[PDB]
């Protein structure tokens, strides 16, 4: 860094910052000033890119030229991710007294340097990311080179790998502390990347949509309880729709909205997207390698009363979860298909048979995407399936519940009482009647709610 | 008060570093990759730091000056200089030649002003001072005069001994200085050396991520004796054109059949990085063994000294 | 090739009308993936950098695998991935997918274990492009099913398949494209459905519409965002940072 | 360890065991005696974590007092599994006196860390069990990483195996020196568990199910006499189900129950599970480096009258399987299926032809876990293989028995007498009928009185 006199940079409140693409980086405070500008223009002959910068975060730049934070580095005690948050911190302030003789508690940055999508695509681009409401948006966060690979280096080893010209893709996940989790991708250097170094994060923080949404008028509470019992006796169900109607938000809400305590589930994704509060739970997830019937086939293996996945690509998985349930497990997943050709072509495409898919599939929802101008809808548009038949056309399927569009209503078509009677015995039956008509917006407490 | 790092030691780590950046990796993956490959820790610990600088956006030369213990003013502006003048790769290979030397010439003092330097001195000045001082046991030994002659003559009749103590300074000065038709048939092909810098080139390439074919490009530019140069434009022609790496070097003489077949296990097994690695760690070593110039210093040095003696005498 | 890259300004060298064009336009923006074919040095490269770098791609993280730099892209949100010694195609597109890529930019198809993780990408619902050397529909059909991608996974998902022409009559070199809408599979079939919207005459050099209608391109998730394309349709400078500068507006 | 004096913990009966999670766990006989609690809490100011254990238990730590063991580890002879434990717990006894001088008999702890369903889900989660009569239950037993990570270990060594992040899971089986078994699936790290490292135990336990077992409903009578007819004359039989069906068990309730002391059998197992009362038996265990197929091949070659392979799933020893069918041997063994696709696919997948199993294959039973809440039911859902067909779709197949799991019962379902008939005569027929109908729980005792 260089400025004029060291005064000049305090009055003023600038301070120059870098030097690329012959123009000298100024962090300035008062970016309107033309006077400081034109001195500024006029006393170093070079031409200027200016960044705004809060006023005491350029004074204090300034004076350091991050020495506090210098010293508590060689603190080998300090970066030890194996003590606890709470101990660690406490060195950090104690070291600190070392200066003027306090406790600071929180010191912001010197905790910010030791203790949903982030886009961070080259040298000196500001970050983008996107926001829950606003989606894809700037920042006014850039890294240089140097900060780019320091990042580079903090993200990938706090992952739990080495990333360097040898090596330079990464992709892991993050485990923050409060159990939760991100992926990251990340590559050094430029050879992959000429762009340079560069990172992408993709956070778990969903908030999954609940039950709650017979609010936006997807589905009728009635079909819910009647899903809700489904669930309950492990009748097996596959979410199909067009793209960006709904599948997974609709798995992952029927999920979450039963009483998942008392039963092992047991879910394969290639990536998370899955929440579920709930305590037996495993949750896996495609590695490097790793087909889907990896996951699968050992897992099914354990005893699984549930089986949740993401969704069926590689169909050589799709066979294994369609004999999953034929065991008899209650298996769930999510498939990309519009209708009933659909699907099945889709299914039978990797050689799972009718028989086997349709006749141990219990239920098929179909979901949607309805807009009328600005509305944005998504609904389930419609699937009982029966069975097989022998000499046939196959796919024996009882539409329950329509959803007309005209009038934005689920109608039923047909459905009988006596068609979802398949109980064990008298009781059983009568439990799912019950739950039929007698079966708090967040996930966390509606799950706590369907628990009771 | 910190120290360097070994001659053999700074040498390993500025050739291939020489290597990977006159191969176009980024100066940072090149950094990365030197670190990784290192068994000392204090080495990869310094080249992880060097890289830390080199990713804030500082020259190499600006990044290895947080450690002048080690890289002292000349280097960092050798390579300062390659940074001003866009020929930081033929700097480097510069800088990798001259701590190869450096190594061979400390080796090979030592073995049987720095160290060098006083050992030097120390041995060239050992015997002919042994010998001024047996001819200062008195007067009247083997050879002399008596002191009463007048000086020029006494001195004249020495110089005998005078020349036999300057044929001894001659040989020691000799053995440090050197130490530290079928026209084909005449040329200078590869050496062990030649084969280990080969080697540890490879192997530091491979580790780092580089394919075997983007290596010998490189490689193969960066190989200094000529016939060997020939014979990798061979290798590398060989195995673009669909060739087994462990066939095209079946054919040259230079690599042994434990090469050739423990790089054919490599090629099988998706290890040649490693392969190359300790092929190149056990040359290395073979190269630093060989011996025969420390053993004939020693054959020149007490018979001149013994000649010097026996001379007067007789 | 002589590059600085060619623009959507090249309906003045006659390839492609600029009514087509705006239905690429549309399409790109609704993520359609599409696939450039053509015989060797047709045009595929750089109509495929043309319509990538043609749209506004500010608001939208796009992300390309090549095995060398070819592709310029005006545009921020973007990550340019290089094959280097070892890596296959896949291992980039593999891990790459893996971030949040609303749109992935192949290079070209070679290695099809990469070609079957772009297809996989497009059926995830990414909006996905590329090259591929071929002539016509058997030509890449059986060039992609090679490597194992079935014509479900292709054809089903991928969306628009232009092919790309060298046209010479003495001395003009003309690059024109040729010709496909690809609607999907058929259960019990031949397969591959294919709607051709233009075709090109080379005794006229004109661009036919041939049974293309209007319900075909419907494909919308509804009324205001058809509407939308319509408008694109009809309603929707040569440099190429000056065109995505105003492509972006 | 830590309390306050010696004295507190003996009058107080409560003993500080470790520290974690920043609290002290303390073992308490008392917890319902708030004033001493409070004490506690006052004296040591941490925060506590309470866990009962019976008085005399508790005093004895006080006086015995992770060291003690920390030394007792450096003990190479300890460990070792070929060492009897009955020598082995006399070593840690005396090598205990170093500290006091006695012999303590029966280090609890010292012992439980040298010497029907567990679900271990991840790290800081608390265990689940199904309970014989409670079924799904949570459980008091939880681990963090380092203890999730150790018993981990623990639990793969014991069973065989290396878990390691190159090798995350792990499906093998723990042999309880009762010569009892079970299945354990196992995974280190998060690469495939996100929620971590995890454990599951399906237990067995063993010496072995007999035919005593129509009391747990799972075959009629009727049919295990229509079996024990089968396995006397040769016919051949695979047991196919879905994990923990019962496959193992049923197949070993068939052989311990016949009387088989007048021909010799011969098993080949990749590790034990098969107990057989009977004399003419060789019992052969896959090695280092051994194939199934060198085992089987090399074992057919003496005179097996009946041939038991563990379960198939390396196909080439299949293959040696079936053509032991075909030369006439009685040959036996399991599969990991569902229904029929699920097997035959299954068998035909490493080139055995449906004309060789099919056609030298007699019967096959397949086995299920039905699940009413919290009953465990295990039953054979149901096969008779009657051959190939020219000109095809091959297996023919005539099923005997289903069982309908709405009332819980075997039906006959279109079998005849005159089916079963394949007898090479009058006599030998006359004798299966007889045993039809003409034809004490262990195991020794069964074989014993099926002898006779």
Avoid at chain 1, 25 to 40: R, T, W
Avoid at chain 2, 35 to 40: E, G, Y
Wanted: aromatic letters at 8%.
């Amino acid at each position: 860094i260089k400025l004029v006199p060291k005064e000049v940079a305090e009055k003023h409140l600038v301070v120059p910052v870098n030097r690329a693409g012959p123009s000298l980086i100024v962090a300035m405070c008062d970016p309107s000033n033309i006077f400081a500008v034109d001195d500024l223009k006029f006393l170093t002959g070079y031409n200027i890119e200016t960044v705004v910068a809060s006023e005491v975060s350029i004074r204090e730049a300034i004076e350091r030229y991050k020495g506090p934070s210098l010293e508590d580095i060689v603190g080998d005690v300090g970066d030890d991710i194996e003590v606890t948050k709470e101990e660690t911190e406490n060195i950090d302030e104690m070291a600190k007294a070392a200066d003027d003789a306090p406790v600071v508690k929180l010191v912001n940055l010197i905790l910010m340097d030791a203790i949903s999508d982030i886009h961070v695509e080259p040298y000196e681009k500001d970050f983008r990311v996107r926001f829950r409401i606003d989606g894809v948006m700037y920042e006014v966060m850039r890294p240089p080179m140097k900060l780019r690979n320091a990042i580079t280096s903090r993200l990938k080893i706090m992952a739990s790998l080495d990333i360097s010209e040898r090596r330079l893709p990464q992709d892991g996940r993050i485990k923050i502390k409060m159990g939760g989790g991100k992926e990251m991708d990340f590559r050094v250097s430029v050879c992959p990347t000429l762009f340079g170094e560069k990172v992408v994060m993709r956070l778990l923080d969903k908030s999954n949509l609940q039950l709650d949404m017979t609010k936006l008028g997807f589905d009728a509470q009635p079909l819910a309880w009647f899903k809700e019992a489904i669930d309950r006796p492990y009748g097996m169900v596959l979410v199909t729709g067009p793209t960006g109607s709904g599948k997974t938000t609709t798995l992952y809400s029927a999920l979450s909205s039963l009483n998942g305590l008392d039963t092992n589930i047991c879910t394969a994704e290639d990536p998370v997207e899955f929440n579920f509060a709930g305590i037996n739970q495993v949750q896996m997830h495609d590695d490097i390698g790793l087909n889907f019937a990896a996951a699968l086939r050992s897992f099914l293996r354990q005893d699984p009363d549930i089986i949740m996945i993401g969704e069926i690509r590689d169909f050589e998985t799709a066979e294994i979860g369609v004999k999953a349930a034929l065991t008899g497990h209650l298996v769930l997943s999510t498939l990309h298909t519009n209708d009933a050709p659909g699907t099945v072509s889709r299914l039978l495409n990797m050689g799972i048979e009718p028989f086997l898919v349709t006749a141990s599939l219990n239920l098929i929802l179909a979901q949607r995407l309805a807009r009328r101008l600005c509305p944005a809808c998504k609904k389930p548009a419609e699937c009982r399936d029966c069975n097989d038949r022998g000499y046939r056309g196959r796919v024996a399927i009882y539409e329950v519940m329509p959803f007309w569009d005209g009038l934005k209503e689920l109608v039923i078509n047909g459905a009988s009482a006596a068609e979802l009677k398949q109980e064990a015995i008298r009781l059983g039956m009568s439990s799912l009647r019950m739950s039929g008509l007698r079966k708090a917006t967040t996930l966390e407490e509606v799950v706590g709610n369907t628990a009771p | 008060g910190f120290g360097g790092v070994e001659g053999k030691d700074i040498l390993v780590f500025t050739r291939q570093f020489a290597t990977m950046i006159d191969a176009g990796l980024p100066l940072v993956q090149c950094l990365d990759i030197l670190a990784s490959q290192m068994d000392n820790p204090s080495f990869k610990k310094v080249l992880f730091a060097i890289k830390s600088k080199v990713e804030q956006g500082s020259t190499f030369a600006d990044a290895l000056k947080e450690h002048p213990k080690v890289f002292d003013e000349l280097y960092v502006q050798l390579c300062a200089a390659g940074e001003v003048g866009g020929i930081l790769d033929a700097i480097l290979n510069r800088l990798a030649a001259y701590r190869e030397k450096n190594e061979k010439l400390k080796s090979k003092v030592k073995s049987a002003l720095v160290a060098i330097g006083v050992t030097a001195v120390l041995l060239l000045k050992v015997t002919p001072v042994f010998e001024k001082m047996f001819a200062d046991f008195g007067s009247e030994l083997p050879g002399p005069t008596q002191m009463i002659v007048n000086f020029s003559h006494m001195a004249q009749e020495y110089f005998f001994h005078v020349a036999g103590s300057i044929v001894a300074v001659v040989m020691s000065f000799t053995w440090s200085y050197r130490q530290p038709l079928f026209m084909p048939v005449f040329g200078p092909v590869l050496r062990k050396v030649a084969v280990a810098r080969f080697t540890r080139t490879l192997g530091t390439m491979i580790s780092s991520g580089v394919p075997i074919l983007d290596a010998l490009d490189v490689t193969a530019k960066t190989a200094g004796n000529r016939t060997v140069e020939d014979a990798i434009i061979y290798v590398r022609g060989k195995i673009a054109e669909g060739k087994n790496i462990a066939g095209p070097l079946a054919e040259t003489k230079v690599f042994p059949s434990m090469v050739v077949q423990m790089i054919g296990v490599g090629e099988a097994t998706g290890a040649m990085d490693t392969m190359l690695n300790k092929i190149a760690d056990f040359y290395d070593d073979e190269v630093d063994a060989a011996a025969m110039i420390e053993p004939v210093l020693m054959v020149f040095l007490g018979g001149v000294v013994g000649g010097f003696l026996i001379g007067m005498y007789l």
